[PDB]
Amino acid sequence: DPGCSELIQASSRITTCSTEGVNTKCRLSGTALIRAGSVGAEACLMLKGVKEDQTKFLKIKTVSSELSCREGQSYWTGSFSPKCLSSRRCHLVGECHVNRCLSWRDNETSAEFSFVGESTTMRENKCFEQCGGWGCGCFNVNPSCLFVHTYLQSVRKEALRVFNCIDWVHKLTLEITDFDGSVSTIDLGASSSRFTNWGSVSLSLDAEGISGSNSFSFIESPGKGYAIVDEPFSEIPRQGFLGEIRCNSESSVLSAHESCLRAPNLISYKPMIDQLECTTNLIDPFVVFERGSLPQTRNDKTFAASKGNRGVQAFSKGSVQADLTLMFDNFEVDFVGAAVSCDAAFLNLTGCYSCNAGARVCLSITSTGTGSLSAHNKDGSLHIVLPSENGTKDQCQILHFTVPEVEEEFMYSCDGDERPLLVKGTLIAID
Amino acid sequence: DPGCSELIQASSRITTCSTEGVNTKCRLSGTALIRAGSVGAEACLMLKGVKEDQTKFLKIKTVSSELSCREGQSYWTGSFSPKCLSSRRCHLVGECHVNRCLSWRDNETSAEFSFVGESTTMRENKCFEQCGGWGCGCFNVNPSCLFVHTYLQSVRKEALRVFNCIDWVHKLTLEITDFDGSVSTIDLGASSSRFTNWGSVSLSLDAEGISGSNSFSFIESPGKGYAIVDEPFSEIPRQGFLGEIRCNSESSVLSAHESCLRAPNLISYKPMIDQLECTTNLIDPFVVFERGSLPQTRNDKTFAASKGNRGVQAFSKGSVQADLTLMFDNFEVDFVGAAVSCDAAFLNLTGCYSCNAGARVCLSITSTGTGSLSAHNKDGSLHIVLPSENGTKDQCQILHFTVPEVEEEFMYSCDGDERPLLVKGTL
Ligand SMILES: *[C@@H]1O[C@H](CO)[C@@H](O[C@@H]2O[C@H](CO)[C@@H](O[C@@H]3O[C@H](CO[C@@H]4O[C@H](CO)[C@@H](O)[C@H](O)[C@@H]4O)[C@@H](O)[C@H](O)[C@@H]3O)[C@H](O)[C@H]2NC(C)=O)[C@H](O)[C@H]1NC(C)=O
Ligand SMILES: *[C@@H]1O[C@H](CO)[C@@H](O[C@@H]2O[C@H](CO)[C@@H](O[C@@H]3O[C@H](CO)[C@@H](O)[C@H](O)[C@@H]3O)[C@H](O)[C@H]2NC(C)=O)[C@H](O)[C@H]1NC(C)=O
Ligand SMILES: *[C@@H]1O[C@H](CO)[C@@H](O)[C@H](O)[C@H]1NC(C)=O
Numbered sequence: 131d132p133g134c135s136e137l138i139q140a141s142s143r144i145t146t147c148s149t150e151g152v153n154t155k156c157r158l159s160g161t162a163l164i165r166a167g168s169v170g171a172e173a174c175l176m177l178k179g180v181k182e183d184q185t186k187f188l189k190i191k192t193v194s195s196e197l198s199c200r201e202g203q204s205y206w207t208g209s210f211s212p213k214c215l216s217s218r219r220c221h222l223v224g225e226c227h228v229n230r231c232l233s234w235r236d237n238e239t240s241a242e243f244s245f246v247g248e249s250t251t252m253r254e255n256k257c258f259e260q261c262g263g264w265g266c267g268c269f270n271v272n273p274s275c276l277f278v279h280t281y282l283q284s285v286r287k288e289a290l291r292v293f294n295c296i297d298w299v300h301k302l303t304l305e306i307t308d309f310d311g312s313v314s315t316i317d318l319g320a321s322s323s324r325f326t327n328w329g330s331v332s333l334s335l336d337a338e339g340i341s342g343s344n345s346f347s348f349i350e351s352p353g354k355g356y357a358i359v360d361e362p363f364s365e366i367p368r369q370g371f372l373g374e375i376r377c378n379s380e381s382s383v384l385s386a387h388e389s390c391l392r393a394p395n396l397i398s399y400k401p402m403i404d405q406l407e408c409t410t411n412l413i414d415p416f417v418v419f420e421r422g423s424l425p426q427t428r429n430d431k432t433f434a435a436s437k438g439n440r441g442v443q444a445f446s447k448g449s450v451q452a453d454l455t456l457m458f459d460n461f462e463v464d465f466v467g468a469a470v471s472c473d474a475a476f477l478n479l480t481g482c483y484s485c486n487a488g489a490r491v492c493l494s495i496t497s498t499g500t501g502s503l504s505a506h507n508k509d510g511s512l513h514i515v516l517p518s519e520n521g522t523k524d525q526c527q528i529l530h531f532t533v534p535e536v537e538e539e540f541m542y543s544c545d546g547d548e549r550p551l552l553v554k555g556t557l558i559a560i561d
Numbered sequence: 562d563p564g565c566s567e568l569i570q571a572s573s574r575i576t577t578c579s580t581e582g583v584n585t586k587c588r589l590s591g592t593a594l595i596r597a598g599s600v601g602a603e604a605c606l607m608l609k610g611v612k613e614d615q616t617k618f619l620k621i622k623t624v625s626s627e628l629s630c631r632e633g634q635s636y637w638t639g640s641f642s643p644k645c646l647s648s649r650r651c652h653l654v655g656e657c658h659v660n661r662c663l664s665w666r667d668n669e670t671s672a673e674f675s676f677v678g679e680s681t682t683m684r685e686n687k688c689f690e691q692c693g694g695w696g697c698g699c700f701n702v703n704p705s706c707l708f709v710h711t712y713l714q715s716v717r718k719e720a721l722r723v724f725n726c727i728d729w730v731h732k733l734t735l736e737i738t739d740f741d742g743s744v745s746t747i748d749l750g751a752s753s754s755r756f757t758n759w760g761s762v763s764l765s766l767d768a769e770g771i772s773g774s775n776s777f778s779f780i781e782s783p784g785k786g787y788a789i790v791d792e793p794f795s796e797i798p799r800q801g802f803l804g805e806i807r808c809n810s811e812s813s814v815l816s817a818h819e820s821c822l823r824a825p826n827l828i829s830y831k832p833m834i835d836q837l838e839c840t841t842n843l844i845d846p847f848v849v850f851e852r853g854s855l856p857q858t859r860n861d862k863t864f865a866a867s868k869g870n871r872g873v874q875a876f877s878k879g880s881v882q883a884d885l886t887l888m889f890d891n892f893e894v895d896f897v898g899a900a901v902s903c904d905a906a907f908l909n910l911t912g913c914y915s916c917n918a919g920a921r922v923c924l925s926i927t928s929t930g931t932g933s934l935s936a937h938n939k940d941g942s943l944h945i946v947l948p949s950e951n952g953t954k955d956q957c958q959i960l961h962f963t964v965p966e967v968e969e970e971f972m973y974s975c976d977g978d979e980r981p982l983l984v985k986g987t988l
């Protein structure tokens with residue numbers, strides 16, 4: 131039931147009217163700029179004829195204002211757990227020769243674990259010096275060597291794809307009701323223009339986008355849906371962050387393949403003579419997914435999965451940061467039709483006084499056909515002219531007051547048969 | 562239950578004996594280096610008399626090897642949660658003028674929250690630009706300003722003290738049984754000597770400290786004991802680590818006091834026009850305490866709360882990384898007199914072959930009073946002499962074999978006789 135959220139009068143300088151003895155028609159030629167309607171509501175342009183009762187409206191409903199994520203970088207991740215094997219040798223036995231233990235290389239497997247065979251899994255190798263001497267079962271008093279071989283294994287049989295958006299492609303869908311009542315639906319992009327019955331329409335300025343977009347990233351769970359993540363995409367594994375372990379494919383997460391990348395020192399070890407514990411404290415990306423699972427709101431946007439060919443989209447919820455440029459190409463409009471009555475009620479009066487922006491008055495208007503409500507205050511200094519329709523709509527325009535305390539009686543009608551309406555509110559002063 | 566884990570023989574170098582009359586007496590003079598016995602077990606020195614039936618033992622038990630934490634730096638931490646207030650003003654209204662919102666400073670309270678007034682709590686302030694225009698209730702198309710005031714509040718009425726150990730004080734406690742059998746208990750620090758009836762005992766080498774001590778820290782939960790944390794202490798508050806929020810006291814943590822220090826950006830915000838959510842993802846220090854609550858074992862050590870005092874200690878579990886220097890002040894020992902027989906079962910053989918250290922035989926000995934066990938085992942090559950003790954005790958000594966698999970055979974005669982025994986093993 132929203133009607134005009136934004137309403138401007140076409141400049142007298144783009145309008146020319148003539149009367150054919152009682153029958154008057156006007157031509158629009160030139161350009162008007164109007165802010166796009168808030169989502170669900172209309173941007174409206176009012177045409178005035180020569181008489182005060184000659185009014186027509188062009189209405190442009192913002193059906194939706196959508197932003198589609200163009201995906202940039204991507205990696206796969208999932209959940210992992212370490213499995214360790216250990217074997218302790220006394221000083222001067224096996225590899226536990228003078229310095230080997232303390233200079234042990236991560237990628238070298240100890241002879242102690244040659245029975246494990248070949249591996250293509252993410253893995254690492256440690257040696258921890260432990261106590262020597264007879265109390266720890268060694269003939270030699272020097273430190274014994276706890277050799278350790280560890281591999282990572284996927285804890286789930288599914289994986290998650292983390293990505294960013296390099297661009298958000300704006301599509302503004304508009305439902306246009308011409309002056310003559312004909313309805314059409316169009317869509318526009320930032321650089322688009324469409325021919326209309328009266329000329330053309332384009333986006334003069336389009337600043338629709340995701341503010342702080344570099345601080346969002348997304349997760350896809352294949353066959354399930356998407357999640358938002360409230361952090362920038364990480365191009366490098368960083369311990370304690372999503373992506374600290376990452377792979378180039380879904381299957382490589384699942385097999386924990388050695389091509390996967392990982393941040394250093396993710397596995398902690400507690401060597402205890404012949405006992406060993408190894409643990410991880412990894413970010414659980416399935417928890418992160420469930421925390422951000424779509425749909426979600428951030429700022430004035432709703433992020434949701436695309437219906438159909440899948441990706442993520444964001445929808446504006448309120449204002450649309452775009453101006454429509456309306457080009458009229460010598461287009462004729464008449465004022466034909468019988469007026470019917472309307473009922474109206476005051477809704478609100480909001481904004482400032484003695485300012486350029488003025489104050490927005492909103493009325494609920496109920497009728498059985500298309501027309502115009504006209505209202506004036508006692509002294510004819512203020513006038514309201516708003517669309518009337520079959521059914522009920524909330525309709526708003528700007529009024530200019532010079533006082534913060536407003537209590538103004540208007541008489542309104544759609545057919546000349548006036549009824550009272552009280553507009554009141556409190557407006558702020560600017561500086 | 563365990564006896565001599567380390568057995569050395571008194572060097573003929575520091576030994577002089579003779580038989581002038583009705584019996585034989587021996588004199589010990591000089592130093593003798595011996596490895597400390599494993600905790601609970603004994604380091605042992607055998608005195609060889611001029612006969613074969615003449616043998617005496619000096620026994621030194623390791624009762625405990627103990628390391629006490631000398632606490633260094635400390636901080637208090639606990640559990641916190643944010644509470645935030647918000648108020649949005651349209652562009653050109655109130656404080657919301659280009660370009661103050663985007664320039665807002667954490668310490669500056671917005672005039673939107675005058676009704677909160679005076680505070681000594683941890684707190685911050687933010688401003689977030691949000692949609693403008695009539696669709697977001699504003700007469701101006703420029704961004705509106707969501708002003709936010711947030712304070713941290715304690716979510717638990719208890720705190721935790723995180724602390725560091727700048728040094729670990731070593732005390733070694735030895736129980737000495739002299740050749741004549743008199744018992745004695747001494748304590749040694751890393752530098753220390755103690756005099757004995759026969760001379761003295763000193764810590765020659767002492768490496769009983771905590772390896773990797775730089776990567777440990779500790780927590781005290783007031784009146785509930787201690788925990789070990791498997792990471793360094795840090796004097797810098799960092800996000801995602803214990804102490805990311807820290808204070809100087811129990812009360813300050815509980816009041817979420819403004820003197821508490823905190824790492825940057827711990828509170829996250831979701832501005833949603835007129836709605837706002839604010840959250841933290843702080844590590845829970847009480848979970849950290851729980852997971853590390855003492856007693857805990859690391860390496861060859863048990864970390865535990867001090868028994869007769871306040872603080873934490875670590876106790877050596879296996880080998881003691883220390884050499885004992887024994888000094889003998891021209892000390893005389895006699896051998897009188899008779900000694901019975903005992904039940905000795907073979908236990909094991911362990912070591913290498915054709916090496917310096919060699920094999921180590923261990924026997925289970927149950928006997929009368931205190932005696933000495935001999936073995937006619939492999940006579941003309943090998944012999945075994947060990948302490949017989951009133952009770953059940955395992956006794957070990959060194960042996961040199963130059964073959965891989967050892968299948969040996971012994972008739973042990975401490976009696977002398979009457980008994981048999983077998984020994985078998987491999988390197
Ligand atoms: C003074 O009065 C005016 C007019 O009443 C108020 O403006 C109105 O504000 C409301 C609440 O924010 C807006 O409602 C929103 O409507 C959108 C529109 O969605 C579309 O509308 C149809 C209704 O038939 C819906 O069923 C569809 O979903 C469709 O998408 C909706 O998405 C929001 O959830 C919300 O309901 C309304 O659009 C707006 N009207 C106009 C003409 O702009 C104004 O807030 C008020 N000011 C005050 C009280 O200070
Ligand atoms: C060979 O046999 C000997 C039997 O004496 C074994 O030596 C013994 O080893 C164990 C440690 O595994 C020790 O037992 C322990 O006692 C301490 C202190 O009381 C306690 O803290 C431990 O929990 C455990 O109960 C024992 O001290 C030690 N004996 C001696 C004399 O040193 C040796 O391990 C055997 N080797 C084998 C079977 O391979
Ligand atoms: C281990 O890494 C070193 C250093 O890059 C490399 O030279 C060597 O080939 C690797 N050794 C393996 C895989 O055994």
Ligand SMILES: *[C@@H]1O[C@H](CO)[C@@H](O)[C@H](O)[C@H]1NC(C)=O
Binds near residue numbers: 666668669
């Ligand atoms: C807040 O930060 C500003 C910027 O330096 C400073 O002027 C002000 O004194 C600070 N407030 C304090 C220290 O309480």
